[PDB]
Amino acid sequence: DIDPLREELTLESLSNVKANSYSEWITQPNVSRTIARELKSFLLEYTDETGRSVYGARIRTLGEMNSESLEVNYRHLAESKAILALFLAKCPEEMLKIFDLVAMEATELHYPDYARIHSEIHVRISDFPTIYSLRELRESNLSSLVRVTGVVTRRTGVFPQLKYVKFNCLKCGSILGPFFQDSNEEIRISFCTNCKSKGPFRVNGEKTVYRNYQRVTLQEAPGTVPPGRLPRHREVILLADLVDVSKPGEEVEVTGIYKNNYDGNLNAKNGFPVFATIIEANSIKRREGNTANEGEEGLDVFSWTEEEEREFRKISRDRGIIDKIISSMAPSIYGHRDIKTAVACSLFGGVPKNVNGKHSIRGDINVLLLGDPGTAKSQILKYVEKTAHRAVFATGQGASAVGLTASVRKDPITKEWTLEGGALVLADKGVCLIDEFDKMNDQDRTSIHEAMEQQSISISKAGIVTTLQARCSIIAAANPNGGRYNSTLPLAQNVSLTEPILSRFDILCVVRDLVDEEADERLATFVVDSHVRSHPENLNARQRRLQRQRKKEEEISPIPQELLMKYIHYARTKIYPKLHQMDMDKVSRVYADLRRESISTGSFPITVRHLESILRIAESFAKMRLSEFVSSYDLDRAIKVVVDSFVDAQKVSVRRQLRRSFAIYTLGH
Amino acid sequence: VVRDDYTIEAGALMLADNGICCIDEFDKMDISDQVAIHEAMEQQTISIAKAGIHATLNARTSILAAANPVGGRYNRKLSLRGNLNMTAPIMSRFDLF
Amino acid sequence: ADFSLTVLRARIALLATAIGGPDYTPPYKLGDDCLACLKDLKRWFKLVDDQQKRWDVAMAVAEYRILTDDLLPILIDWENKCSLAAKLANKAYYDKIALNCLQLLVLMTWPLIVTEQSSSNQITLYGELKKHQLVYKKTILSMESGKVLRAAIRLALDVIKIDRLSRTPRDNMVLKLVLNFFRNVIAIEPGEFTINTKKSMPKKGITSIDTLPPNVSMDDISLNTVISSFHKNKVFGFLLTLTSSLSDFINIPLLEIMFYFTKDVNQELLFPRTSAGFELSKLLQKEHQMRKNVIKHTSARHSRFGGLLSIQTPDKTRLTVSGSQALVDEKIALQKLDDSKKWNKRIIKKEGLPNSLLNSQTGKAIFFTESNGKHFKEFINNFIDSGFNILLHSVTNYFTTEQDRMVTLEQVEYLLFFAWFVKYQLLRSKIDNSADIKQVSEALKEVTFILVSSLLRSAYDLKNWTVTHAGMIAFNELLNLVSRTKAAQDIEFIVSRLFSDERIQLLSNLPKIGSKYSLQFMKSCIELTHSVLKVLEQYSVNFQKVQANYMTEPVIETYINFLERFRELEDDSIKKVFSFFHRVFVQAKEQALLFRFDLIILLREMLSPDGLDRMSRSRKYVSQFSDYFLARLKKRLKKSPAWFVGLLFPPLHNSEVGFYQRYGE
Amino acid sequence: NDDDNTEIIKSFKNFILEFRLDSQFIYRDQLRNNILVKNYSLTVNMEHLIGYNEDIYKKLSDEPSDIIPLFETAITQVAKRISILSRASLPTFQLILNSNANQIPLRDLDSEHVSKIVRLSGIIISTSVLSSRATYLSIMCRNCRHTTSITINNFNVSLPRSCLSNCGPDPYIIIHESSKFIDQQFLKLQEIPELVPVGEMPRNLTMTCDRYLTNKVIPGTRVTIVGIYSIYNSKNGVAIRTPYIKILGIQSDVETSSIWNSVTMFTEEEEEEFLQLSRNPKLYEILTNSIAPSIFGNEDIKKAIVCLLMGGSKKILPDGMRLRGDINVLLLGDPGTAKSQLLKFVEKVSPIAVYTSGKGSSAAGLTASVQRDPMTREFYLEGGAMVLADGGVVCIDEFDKMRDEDRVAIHEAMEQQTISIAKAGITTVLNSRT
Amino acid sequence: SPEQTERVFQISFFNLPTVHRIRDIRSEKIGSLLSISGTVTRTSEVRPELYK
DNA sequence: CACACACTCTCCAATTCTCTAA
DNA sequence: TTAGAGAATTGGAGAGTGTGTTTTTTTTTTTTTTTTT
Ligand SMILES: Nc1ncnc2c1ncn2[C@@H]1O[C@H](COP(=O)(O)OP(=O)(O)NP(=O)(O)O)[C@@H](O)[C@H]1O
Ligand SMILES: Nc1ncnc2c1ncn2[C@@H]1O[C@H](COP(=O)(O)OP(=O)(O)NP(=O)(O)O)[C@@H](O)[C@H]1O
Ligand SMILES: [Mg+2]
Ligand SMILES: [Mg+2]
Ligand SMILES: [Zn+2]
Ligand SMILES: [Zn+2]
């Protein structure tokens, strides 16, 4: 009594392939129905290690965001109904074509009529278990799913591409059948149903539907490219909801379908029957974080789950959360709590302000690590590159005026001018880290002056006249004149910089590597223990390695590093603290004292941009407590940071007088 | 950085990644060119921001440097720190002399 | 209609998954209700392909791999389950599903034919279904190395164990089933290509003939793999015991098998008459001599060098020819002047049966490995010494009764089987002396001579050439046998007396029509005629009168047309032709019958350095014949100048002039 | 189908003739007032179209490219009725739209919007020369010499493949003498700086306007557009085609005057506010405190920035000698003194201005640069910051960090008010009075 | 398992009696097995030939 | 556009096939 | 059995249709990086 064309199989039965290819098996109607029900049952019945329905939590977020794309983790298929994980790797172009319909029905169970919001859902497969460089791809990958790493090197505009097309025949019918269009090659039809002979056509205008299209040239990552040998590339194609996901110069990781097609230009110039190859992208991830890490799944390492936001809210009300977070900045670097304090403030930032639309104030905190050799100035900066959301690193003679900032490119083909963004654009809403800042050329170093305060880059070159945004915090590391700090001199004589750039930095840290027989025991003990703990030879393995990684990390740090990375991004994106105005007498007397004692000739350039700094730093401490309001304890911690950093920059001949004069502000916390 | 789009041309410290870069005439090297190795000696990476090509590159290289005193003769009246035009930032990078 | 096709595919795919699977605990497990699924699939084959002549079920059972993924594993596991028990010496249930698996193997492997009576849907699928049959043969021969052929002989042993008398017809049926299974696995053979000719050719021809599926090589299907898998699975020992145990029901399947794997083996490879390196070397020296002749015809400078010749001719007028080679060689100049002509006269050029010695190229040879070649020759030597004599005696009775029912396929597989075995066993007894000739003594018995001669006569009279060709082959072999036994020593005289009037006229007419048919037909007529004339000469009704029945222009025409193919002939066949021309010239003094121009061109084209090899035994007697021919031609021309036109044209029949032309008073 | 178009047309004639608020027939009156001064267009505010009959707005917004050109003919039929005596001609009227639909950010335009009326905003970075599109082709056959014509409306037609009445496969030539044409202009619009996503280059659209919307803007102006987001099949991927906007209504935000020969574009309700303000006895106190109100002190710098925003007076002598009327000011000083915050303020108060950094600048990028056009392969001249800022203020921050070769290019443009060029066979003196 | 294809075999001859230079190349040796010594200036992507 | 090449379509007569009487 | 008259199929003339073709490419300005100035 069942319809013979409708009848179905079992999970036992799918493995017994009985067709000449997976392509031919997956497309048979009874097989297709069985696959759909299995994939449906995976999304409905799978639950987390904690026992929550993770794909319910993903579907909630899908329909609330009105997102068209559902993230699915490949490990969750390898851990349950694993033949589906196998077919998905072997022939994704047919398997995803079913799993997109199953995902539509899985979300429509939750949100009836979501069809009126999007007609279709796309599955963004994540954490695919094997990875290739672009050099390692071979013909045996064709039509299979790949995961691949590279630098997105060109990224064309976003265009409407035709998706469903009817055709007009010139001879007869305005209705040739609706071809779904393949994103690789022309329609090539050679026939008409309304007239059974060859003839001309026009693409029909009664109905069509469009999808967004964008190519991306993806090249090998220069740290995996063997030196002196050329980087390889591939064309990548991004379709609807994947367009505009990555910016030129990011290290990107793609999952997608490796495909090939005939084109005559290859066959013409190469003289062999050779086919061009294209990765149709199915998901994209950006290779931020430390990357030598198993504990960090998903397409976005700085996303949080609801059980993670609730954990941030819990710890944010720990008494002493600021001093726990500060102790967790570079937890394997001993001492330097003033640098860790300055790094914490710069890494959370203040609040940017606009006043009636007329005027604006800088919210980012800039930091100068000035000091002696072998003192973790460069290790502190390399830690902030792992820890910050968007970050860029640059060094001395390796950084130019317009490799920072921005430059104008001339195309070789269309051969008119365009902008390429520098390090202060690619770190926008983020940090730029400038190692050996004293050893930059003055012509290169003075490119930063606009991006410090106005947080913009105003180019007028080659008839391009415009302004980019450049809201970075800048952290810089430098050595004094002669390579060593000389404590009897004023700051303006210890350094080759000048007042306009020294005043743009709004925390200064001076590091003196003085000999002491007990601090050098405490430091040497910590460094010896840090080598033994970090040694590369010191309930299944993919989980079992995480209990030892957690053991070793929590010896050093008050807070897990994975939690602190997400806690910082959360505090930067959600929290924007306001001021109660009870500060007026403290901050005004601090500024008046700091200005009056700055009559000394070579002293630090305390300026109105250094009153304004106390207000930024107070907002950064309120962000660390995850508060929407600055307290008087944040105003005291900020005045202590700014007064201590001013007093530590003075010559030993007046440091006693200044510690004695400022005691009500230095001893305030 | 090479053009005509910009790209990376590998240098002596990258071509020796996971091996030894041997540098002769070291004291006769211009100090403006000497300072370029301070990241590659210690942080073992070269990082770049020029035109349209920001980058970070491996330089996991041991350095062996040969030098002459300023004046040719090792002035035996002086500690090593005075015979040689090097400053504390690079003098502290070499493990032993 | 197309809904019916996709519902049929869906129903058969759901039956195909219902049979069983690897179990994954791999050891294939029977599905519950497997017998009912097998019986239902047999019902599907019958109740569609018999009832509606469609082939659609037989096509779609290959799509879902039922043979290679279910029927083969089921038979091979059941074979192991019975082998183990025999070495220990519900099995009554598993018998029924083993039998029904063999039943479906025979249905799926059954030979395909296309005919006038063929369906519009069968002719559509024919060329495709031959590919799936090629995959079935590869899989049957290689899947666990022919263990399924071992399972087939086991199902035959199950009925060989019970007596020749006390057996039931429902078991003699199983014997015929197993024999039909082997003939099918043998006679899966790669298909014909076919083109629609309603629309004329483009500026290239048929750019590939290659009728093979994506994962089959030509070697996976060859008799080498067949012989290998038969010897490893003791199939030959089964066939040999079976063909000896004949002391009616099965004789015709058994002859069919012996035809289907003797057909394309030219026997001479079975007798050789560092060795492979010496053989390679001699052939490279012949190709070197050919390339030396091509180099002697090629430009000593580049293609563009441009030298241009003018040839003065009678009537004191010019032609022109390009190329440095033409300047020095007058013969090359005239050859080039003919080569460039843009005219060609239109040529004229010429059924359900397998490719065989009737149809395959004269040069074709199948390359046995050295173990395969010894395993084959030892099998057929045992078969000849045991069972050929009784097997031929049995089927020649069954077909002397019942002649009119033999559709052309039975008629060929009888005639060719008779000829091939008698030729092989004559040749074995030529080289080996311990081979008896008289082991095939049945071939000359009066009942078989009468059958072969009747059958050829009826095929000639009904104009069925494929059967007349097969008749001519078998008659040529019977004549070889008669001549051999006469030389060895009254049955010779009985057959030799039996053709005196009418078969003489038939065998004289055969070469007169020969010029209208394929090279293999002309070859057979020439080998037959050589043998006949050698017999009648040895016996002496009147040699002069009977050979004068052959000395007529139409025979000389087919001899010239066979000799035009000489670049692909062998020295044996050229020696047969020139023996006949020597017979016409010297023994008859007929010589005017051969003076026509077609022979003069053909002698030059083969006596040329570009023609026959100079070191060939074949060239020596052509050179000798040509010297005698030109002497008699010079004499005739000096005596009668009109012969320059008479040599250009066919001969006359106006009486007085026709006699004078032929003999010179 | 032409029964259906006749009902759509009849329903919009009745919108013009019946739509009234208070005593006044505001679209009949606007048509007549536009006919007399000879602009053949109507501006329609879409809240009024929704108020009259929402089914018409539904029709219009479902498929604009097929309904806009039906409302243009409905406007012409009313334009004849209200301005010519029957039984005793006008061109095809333009329809211009005003809207308060939500602005779509320029980067959020995607396949969901193709063929829809879309309102957005941006900075005009470029304007082309005018080009001629046809609105009426006169037509004649090559072979039989039959003659006819093709009315054209410029949304999403070509020469007929058949003679209309062997006459041939492509029979028609255009009679240029009897054809009629309209102006078309291309703009390019960048998105607004405060709407660019983090770390991206500001995105760009090309777009087209025609008739009375041409010349209504200049490079650097901030505009809001209403238009049809649409596609064209450029020859410059697969099954892919380029997006653009058919502009239906430019609306410049501050009444920044566009291409403008000082003409009297002000209105009496603001001119009488200015003519009272001029006569306030405290006016220079009011304007001084209105400069950068969040910057404390610097009173003389504010007083001088007020002088710079007015300038002096330009003079032209009977000698032919030209006197500079523009005032130039240098803020030379210590760090953190509000020099750059005052430059970022004068960029916003001045009706035309450009902020730039001397370190981010070139001689060519400041004055004018010679480009090479990739199609003609000819050189052509493009204006830099001094030409973009012409008639206004250029703010040059970090003027001490400008290269000595780049600072010198400014010497002519600060005194003689020109940019002289002699490059690639171009030579000109461009005006630049800043 | 699915069906797995025909395997293609790369026969790799080596250790020839003699080596030719790029300047020794002559069309007379077309279709014959040589060995060639040289230095690589460039290498292309690894691309798929349509073989069968 | 117009003029060569590439390629298909269609008709006509030239040749060979088949049957009959001399 | 030859030979000659009438029937069928194939070759190719030639008419018809359809497609591509010009073609360049340095020069002159503007920029951004290395190094040799
Ligand atoms: N306080 C510290 N605690 C632990 N390790 C340290 C400390 N100070 C320095 N080190 C280690 O010693 C090395 C020197 O740090 P590094 O960041 O390279 O020095 P630096 O301060 O930037 N000096 P320099 O490059 O010469 O200006 C690194 O391997 C650090 O890990
Ligand atoms: N007088 C002031 N009144 C109000 N805010 C001020 C004042 N002076 C300085 N500031 C603020 O402090 C910062 C000064 O930076 P900026 O205006 O860029 O300094 P600048 O004069 O251009 N100095 P510089 O670029 O170093 O030569 C801005 O955020 C100002 O709003
Ligand atoms: Mg360092
Ligand atoms: Mg400033
Ligand atoms: Zn059609
Ligand atoms: Zn006409």
* Resolution for the entry shown, Å: 3.7
Which letter does DSSP use for residue C303 in this model? T
Report CA D425 to chain centroid distance, whole Å.
Answer: 31
Tell me how far apart the 2 most distant CA atoms of chain A are, in Å: 102
Could you tell me if A260 and A267 are in contact, meaning their C-beta atoms sit under 8 angstroms apart? no
- What is the H or E stretch that residue A236 is in? strand A233-238
Residues 6+ apart with CB under 8 A from A229: none
Q: How far apart are the first and last CA of chain C?
A: 81
Any ligand 2 atom below 6 A from CB of A318 = no
User: Does the beta-carbon distance from A409 to B5 stay under 8 Å?
Assistant: yes
The tokens for A303 are 């996303």
Residues 6+ apart with CB under 8 A from C167: C159
| Alpha carbon of C444 to ligand 6 centroid (Å) | 90
Q: How far apart are the first and last CA of chain D?
A: 58
Could you tell me if A625 and A321 are in contact, meaning their C-beta atoms sit under 8 angstroms apart? yes
Could you tell me if C16 and C57 are in contact, meaning their C-beta atoms sit under 8 angstroms apart? no
Domain A301-665, second-level architecture: 3-Layer(aba) Sandwich (3.40)
The three-state secondary structure class of E40 is coil
Break positions in chain C: residue before each gap, C to N over 2.5 angstroms: 25, 89, 247, 273, 350, 489, 540
Residues 191-220 of C with CB under 7 A from strand F: 199-200, 202-203
Number of CB atoms found within 10 A of residue C574's CB: 21
The tokens for A89 are 């790797």
User: Does the beta-carbon distance from D362 to A607 stay under 8 Å?
Assistant: no
Q: HSE on the CB side for C564, CA within 13 Å?
A: 13
Method used to obtain the model: cryo-EM
Q: What is the DSSP string of A154-194?
A: EE---EEEEEEEEEEESSS-S-EEEEEP-SSS-------SS
The tokens for A644 are 């201590």
> Hey, what amino acid is at A511?
V
Which chains have 3 or more CB–CB distances shorter than 8 Å to chain E?
A, C
How far, in Å, CA of C144 to CA of C150, rounded? 11
Could you tell me if A366 and B11 are in contact, meaning their C-beta atoms sit under 8 angstroms apart? no
Distance C202 CA to F4 C1' (A): 21
Separation in Å, CA D102 to CA A65, A146, C49, D119, D121: 20, 42, 69, 7, 11
- Hey, which residues does C321 pair with through a beta bridge? C309
Could you tell me if A651 and A598 are in contact, meaning their C-beta atoms sit under 8 angstroms apart? no
Put simply, whether E7 touches A (Cβ < 8 Å) is no
Distance A407 CA to G32 C1' (A): 8
How far, in Å, CA of C83 to CA of C144, rounded? 15
Nucleotide nearest to D367 (CA to C1'): G30
Domain A29-130 class? Answer: alpha beta
**Chain E residues touching A269 at Cβ < 8 A:** none
The three-state secondary structure class of E1 is coil
Residues 6+ apart with CB under 8 A from D399: D330, D358, D407
| Alpha carbon of A627 to ligand 2 centroid (Å) | 29
For residue E42, give the chain A residue with the closest CA: A230
Number of CB atoms found within 10 A of residue A601's CB: 8
Put simply, whether A343 touches B (Cβ < 8 Å) is no
Could you tell me if A404 and A424 are in contact, meaning their C-beta atoms sit under 8 angstroms apart? yes
How far, in Å, CA of C427 to CA of C417, rounded? 16
Per-domain residue ranges of chain A: 29-130, 131-162+210-288, 163-209, 301-665
User: Does the beta-carbon distance from E46 to A274 stay under 8 Å?
Assistant: no
Question: Which of C386, C415, C428, C526 lies closest to C478 in space, CA to CA?
Answer: C415
Q: What is the DSSP string of C56-124?
A: HHHHHHHHTTHIIIIIHHHHHHHHHHHHHHHHH--HHHHHHHHHHHHHHHHHHHSPP---TT--HHHHH
SS (H, E, C) chain D: CHHHHHHHHHHHHHHHHHCCECCECHHHHHHHHHHHCCCCEEEEEHHHHHHHCHHHHHHHHHCHHHHHHHHHHHHHHHHHHCCCCCCCCCCCCEEEEECCCCCCCHHHCCHHHCCCEEEEEEEEEEECCCEEEEEEEEEEECCCCCEEEEECCCCCCCCCCCCCCCCCCCCEEEEEEEEEEEEEEEEEEECCHHHCCCCCCCCEEEEEEEHHHCCCCCCCCEEEEEEEEEEECCCCCCCECEEEEEEEEEEECCCCCCCCCCCCCCCHHHHHHHHHHCCCCCHHHHHHHHCCCCCCCCHHHHHHHHHHHHCCCCEECCCCCEECCCCCCCCCCCCCCCHHHHHHHHHHHCCCEEEEEHHHECHHHHCEEEEECCCCCCEEEEECHHHHCCCCEEEEECCCCCCHHHHCCHHHHCCCCEEEEEECCEEEEEECCC
| Residue bearing the CA closest to ligand 1, atom 8 | A375
Instruction: Check whether A157 is labelled as a binding-site residue.
Output: no
Q: Dihedrals φ, ψ of A655, to 5°?
A: -55, -40
How far, in Å, CA of A425 to CA of C81, rounded? 75
Distance E51 CA to F5 C1' (A): 32
Q: Is B19 exposed, middle or buried (0-12, 13-18, 19+ CB in 10 A)?
A: exposed
The three-state secondary structure class of B91 is helix
Q: What does the CA dihedral C39, C41, C42, C48 come to, rounded to 10 degrees?
A: 140
Could you tell me if D308 and D298 are in contact, meaning their C-beta atoms sit under 8 angstroms apart? no
Could you tell me if D400 and A480 are in contact, meaning their C-beta atoms sit under 8 angstroms apart? no
Any ligand 1 atom below 6 A from CB of A277 = no
- Hey, which residues does A208 pair with through a beta bridge? A165
Could you tell me if C501 and C547 are in contact, meaning their C-beta atoms sit under 8 angstroms apart? no
Question: Which of C580, C596, C484 lies closest to C525 in space, CA to CA?
Answer: C580
Question: Which of C598, C597, C560, C553 lies closest to C578 in space, CA to CA?
Answer: C560
How far, in Å, CA of D201 to CA of A248, rounded? 10
Q: Which nucleotides on chain F have any atom < 7 A from a protein Cβ?
A: 1, 7-10, 15-17
For residue E4, give the chain C residue with the closest CA: C215
Report CA D132 to chain centroid distance, whole Å.
Answer: 17
Any ligand 2 atom below 6 A from CB of A609 = yes
The three-state secondary structure class of C163 is coil
Put simply, whether C215 touches E (Cβ < 8 Å) is yes
Separation in Å, CA A224 to CA A219, B53, D370: 11, 17, 42
Put simply, whether C69 touches A (Cβ < 8 Å) is yes
Could you tell me if A174 and A165 are in contact, meaning their C-beta atoms sit under 8 angstroms apart? no
Separation in Å, CA B79 to CA A501, A638, B76: 37, 45, 8
Buried b (16+ CB within 10 A) or exposed e, C283-322: eeeeeeeeeebeeeeeeeeeeeeeeebeeeeeeeeeeebe
Could you tell me if A227 and B14 are in contact, meaning their C-beta atoms sit under 8 angstroms apart? yes
Q: Is D251 exposed, middle or buried (0-12, 13-18, 19+ CB in 10 A)?
A: middle
How far, in Å, CA of D422 to CA of D415, rounded? 19
Could you tell me if D65 and D155 are in contact, meaning their C-beta atoms sit under 8 angstroms apart? yes
Which letter does DSSP use for residue C346 in this model? P
Could you tell me if D78 and D93 are in contact, meaning their C-beta atoms sit under 8 angstroms apart? no
Tokens 């390196």, residue located: C277
Question: Which of C58, C89, C57, C96 lies closest to C74 in space, CA to CA?
Answer: C96
How far, in Å, CA of A123 to CA of C346, rounded? 66
Q: What does the CA dihedral D285, D288, D294, D297 come to, rounded to 10 degrees?
A: -90
**Rg of chain B over all Cα atoms, to the nearest angstrom:** 16
How far, in Å, CA of A441 to CA of A403, rounded? 13
How far, in Å, CA of C595 to CA of B60, rounded? 95
How far, in Å, CA of C320 to CA of A433, rounded? 87
Question: Which of A281, A286, A311 lies closest to A301 in space, CA to CA?
Answer: A286
Any ligand 2 atom below 6 A from CB of D100 = no
- Residue A160 has its nearest CB partner, among D114, D125, D344, at D114
**Distant-in-sequence contacts of B25-32, Cβ < 8 A, 24+ apart:** B25/B66, B25/B68, B26/B65, B26/B66, B26/B67, B27/B67, B27/B68, B27/B69, B27/B70, B27/B84, B27/B85, B27/B86, B28/B68, B31/B85, B32/A397
The three-state secondary structure class of A279 is strand
How far, in Å, CA of A119 to CA of A240, rounded? 12
- Hey, which residues does D323 pair with through a beta bridge? D315
> Hey, what amino acid is at D409?
A
Q: How far apart are the first and last CA of chain A?
A: 83
Ligand closest to the CA atom of residue D299: 2
SS (H, E, C) A336-372: CHHHHHHHHHHHHCCCCEEECCCEEECCCCCEEEEEC
Q: Dihedrals φ, ψ of A66, to 5°?
A: 45, 30
Question: Which of A99, A98, A144 lies closest to A124 in space, CA to CA?
Answer: A99
Query: Nearest-CA distance from A333 to chain D in Å?
Result: 32
How far, in Å, CA of D385 to CA of D139, rounded? 48
Break positions in chain B: residue before each gap, C to N over 2.5 angstroms: 4
User: Does the beta-carbon distance from B56 to A223 stay under 8 Å?
Assistant: yes
Number of CB atoms found within 10 A of residue A656's CB: 10
How far, in Å, CA of C389 to CA of C212, rounded? 39
Could you tell me if A416 and D374 are in contact, meaning their C-beta atoms sit under 8 angstroms apart? yes
Distance D365 CA to G25 C1' (A): 27
> Do the strands A430-435 and A472-478 form a parallel or antiparallel pair, or are they unpaired?
parallel
User: Does the beta-carbon distance from B54 to A397 stay under 8 Å?
Assistant: no
Residues 6+ apart with CB under 8 A from D119: D99, D101, D102, D103, D104, D224, D225, D226
- Residue E49 has its nearest CB partner, among A20, A135, A273, at A273
Question: Which of A423, A431, A604 lies closest to A506 in space, CA to CA?
Answer: A604
Instruction: Check whether A358 is labelled as a binding-site residue.
Output: no
Number of CB atoms found within 10 A of residue D278's CB: 8
For residue A142, give the chain E residue with the closest CA: E48
Could you tell me if A207 and A146 are in contact, meaning their C-beta atoms sit under 8 angstroms apart? no
How far, in Å, CA of C648 to CA of D258, rounded? 102
Report CA D47 to chain centroid distance, whole Å.
Answer: 24
The three-state secondary structure class of B3 is strand
> Hey, what amino acid is at C418?
F
Ligand closest to the CA atom of residue A355: 2
Q: How far apart are the first and last CA of chain E?
A: 23
User: Does the beta-carbon distance from B88 to A484 stay under 8 Å?
Assistant: yes
The three-state secondary structure class of A273 is coil
Any ligand 1 atom below 6 A from CB of A373 = yes
> Do the strands D41-45 and A276-286 form a parallel or antiparallel pair, or are they unpaired?
unpaired
* Residue length of chain C: 665
Which letter does DSSP use for residue C451 in this model? H
Residues with CB under 7 A from strand G: A 400-403, 407-408, 410, 461-462; B 1, 3, 6, 50-51; C 343-344, 346, 653; D 362-365, 368-370, 372, 377, 379, 423-424
How far, in Å, CA of D329 to CA of D303, rounded? 11
Question: Which of A360, A428, A433 lies closest to A572 in space, CA to CA?
Answer: A428
Tokens 């109507």, residue located: D42
Tokens 């703010």, residue located: D395
How far, in Å, CA of C601 to CA of C594, rounded? 12
Question: Which of C138, C121, C148 lies closest to C54 in space, CA to CA?
Answer: C121
Q: Sign of dihedral through CA atoms D252, D258, D262, D265? A: negative
- Strands, DSSP E only, in A396-519? 406-410, 417-421, 430-435, 456-461, 464-469, 472-478, 507-511
Ligand 1: atom nearest CA of A334 is 3
Mutation target to probe the C interface, by most C beta carbons within 10 A, among E6, E7, E8, E52 is E6
The tokens for A245 are 């996901």
The tokens for D264 are 């009297």
Put simply, whether E33 touches A (Cβ < 8 Å) is no
How far, in Å, CA of A479 to CA of A494, rounded? 9
How far, in Å, CA of C416 to CA of C262, rounded? 9
How far, in Å, CA of D296 to CA of D342, rounded? 11
